[PDB]
């Protein structure tokens, strides 16, 4: 399992996540996406604030990190300002891969250019063999995108004519 | 205004810990150089720490500065977010 | 170099990567206060 840490400077309502997969398993396989807290010593903890199961069909893939699969939870994740949180990705199948950005390496779609600085300074890529002990990768971070929402006055559903 | 010299010092310092061996240079921010560090310690008794000693191989320009902090150590042997001391050291 | 200490490195001062075989060259000073202190100023 892999994980990526992040944080916000203010209280934000996390509505959905963005992830990029390079390959996936068969139809029946699935990947469990979780959001876990971060301890005082800068590592993920056992507390789980969100969890959802993504089937193989929902996982879009691409050979140039262009396809973005959107992850939605049922309860919104309320991220407190100044508190670090970690996305966690678990799956029993051994045929799942994800795009990762590493410093000093060439870009996939632009080999002429190289990632000069850290990809995401305030986060760290993690790897584990049992989802308890995490090995950090300081120079590497996942390609991801976090979406925060703001709620408006009223909502409407229209049903198709009977 | 006038200057003044502290004749009888309010305390006497003594170097209790000293790691003198050095072999290499490590950048203070290795993972963001284009194209922070810490060091743990402990004492067997209650001691009043007064000052630190550090050794720098190179520094930046005049306007640059380095923040020196003392942080606590958590139960699983890693630094925590608590800060017990903090100061700013100029390039000079 | 220092048995009871470990060198650490981090990209965000939160996640620390230890270096077991390496330690900083440093020294820590401890103080013992005395009964009185005295200042003298330059002459007027």
TrEMBL record, chain C:
This is Uncharacterized protein. The lineage of its organism: Viruses, Duplodnaviria, Heunggongvirae, Uroviricota, Caudoviricetes. The chain holds residues 911 to 954 of 1152 of the full protein.
């Amino acid at each position: 399992p892999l994980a990526q840490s992040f944080q916000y400077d203010e209280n934000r309502t996390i509505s959905s996540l963005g992830l990029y997969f390079a390959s996936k398993g068969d139809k029946q396989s699935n990947v469990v996406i979780q959001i876990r807290g971060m301890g005082d010593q800068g590592y993920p903890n056992k507390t789980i604030y969100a969890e959802t199961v993504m089937n193989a069909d929902d996982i879009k893939v691409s050979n140039n990190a262009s396809a973005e699969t959107r992850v939605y939870f049922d309860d919104p994740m309320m991220a407190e300002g100044g508190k670090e949180y970690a996305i966690v990705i678990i799956t029993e199948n051994s045929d799942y891969t994800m795009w990762v950005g590493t410093r000093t390496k060439p870009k996939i779609d632009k080999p002429n250019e190289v990632i000069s600085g850290n990809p995401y300074l305030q986060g760290v890529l993690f790897s584990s063999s049992n989802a308890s002990t995490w090995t950090p990768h300081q120079n590497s971070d996942l390609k991801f995108g976090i979406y925060t929402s703001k709620f408006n006055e009223t909502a409407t559903i229209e049903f198709e004519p009977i | 205004h006038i200057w003044g010299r502290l004749i009888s010092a309010p305390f006497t310092e003594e170097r209790t810990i000293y790691q003198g061996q050095a072999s290499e240079t490590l950048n203070v921010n290795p993972y963001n150089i284009p194209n922070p560090l810490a060091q743990s310690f402990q004492y067997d008794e209650n001691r009043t720490i007064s000052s630190l000693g550090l050794y720098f191989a190179s520094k930046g320009d005049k306007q640059s500065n380095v923040v020196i902090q003392i942080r606590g150590m958590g139960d699983q042997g890693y630094p925590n977010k608590t800060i017990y001391a903090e100061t700013v050291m100029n390039a000079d």
